[PDB]
């Protein structure tokens with residue numbers, strides 16, 4: 001599913017993400033924009049053989065099982081394919097675990113390089129939230 005900007009903002013809000021660990025909704029929508037272009041089915045292979053999945057490009061190295069990342073963990077206790085559903089519940093609940101682990105949203109490279117310190121409220125501007 002390719003979300004619209006405000007559509008995704010409202011879904012993330014419904015699921016607990018706005019202001020989660022202090023990160024305003026615009027930070028999450030910006031991160032999704034640059035990680036996946038709002039496509040729940042986005043995958044990208046990393047040089048080390050792990051793979052990033054879903055709207056927030058969650059990495060099989062630590063967070064989900066795909067059966068093909070030797071030595072990896074599955075800290076969200078999910079198959080990585082659950083991170084590709086049109087329903088964002090599994091991605092949101094795993095992202096809540098990621099953003100609590102110490103480094104906040106710096107876990108998302110696209111957020112640090114393209115959202116951090118910018119006007120992230122622009123990503124929810126005009127949305128009927």
Ligand SMILES: [Cl-]
Nearest residue numbers: 024026120121
């Ligand atoms: Cl915001």
Ligand SMILES: [Cl-]
Nearest residue numbers: 067068069070
């Ligand atoms: Cl594996």
Ligand SMILES: [Cl-]
Nearest residue numbers: 011086087088
């Ligand atoms: Cl949803």
Ligand SMILES: [Cl-]
Nearest residue numbers: 021103104105
């Ligand atoms: Cl933080």
Ligand code: NA
Nearest residue numbers: 060064072073
């Ligand atoms: Na894994």
